[PDB]
Design a protein around this ligand. Structure first.
Ligand SMILES: [Cl-]
Ligand SMILES: [Cl-]
Ligand SMILES: [K+]
Length: 164
């Protein structure tokens, strides 16, 4: 298990433009194209991201390319965020992956704002942190995924991704 395998399980792999859980145009491995309700806008973003006129369909290799960029970008954002960096730096690798996962899905801004959860994590109060994290729109809207991420933070193990 690793952050790529983990997010690959949580995000799936789809080669054509589709709507994510929030109803936003996405493609590949959770590559958010835009929040715009316009398919055309989404196609325009895709073409720009990929470097060619796609007409909304990409290859697996292309999906993987965006994904790698996305994973890296999330990490990079974390390292550049004053709120997340210290937390991120305080964690073991497994937990770091859980954090990257959250940022990838929720967005850096949202995560950076979970002040209390972030503090519990940094304090290494795993169970408490886990309880705290569930008190969110995040958990409510995507509880199965949230539970996996949460268990990862609680335990420091990949048990949640075990038989996936
Ligand atoms: Cl991009
Ligand atoms: Cl879910
Ligand atoms: K998805």
């Amino acid at each position: 298990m690793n952050i790529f395998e983990m997010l690959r399980i949580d995000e799936g792999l789809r080669l054509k433009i589709y709507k994510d859980t929030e109803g936003y145009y996405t493609i590949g491995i959770g590559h958010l194209l835009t929040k715009s309700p316009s398919l055309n806008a989404a196609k325009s973003e895709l073409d720009k991201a990929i470097g060619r006129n796609t007409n909304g369909v990409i290859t697996k290799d292309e999906a993987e390319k965006l994904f790698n960029q996305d994973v890296d970008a999330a990490v990079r954002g974390i390292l550049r965020n004053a709120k997340l960096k210290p937390v991120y730096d305080s964690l073991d690798a497994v937990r770091r992956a859980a954090l990257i996962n959250m940022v990838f899905q929720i967005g850096e801004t949202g995560v950076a704002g979970f002040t209390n959860s972030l503090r519990m994590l940094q304090q290494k109060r795993w169970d408490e942190a886990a309880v705290n994290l569930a008190k969110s729109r995040w958990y409510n809207q995507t509880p199965n995924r949230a539970k996996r991420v949460i268990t990862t933070f609680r335990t420091g193990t990949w048990d949640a991704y075990k038989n996936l």
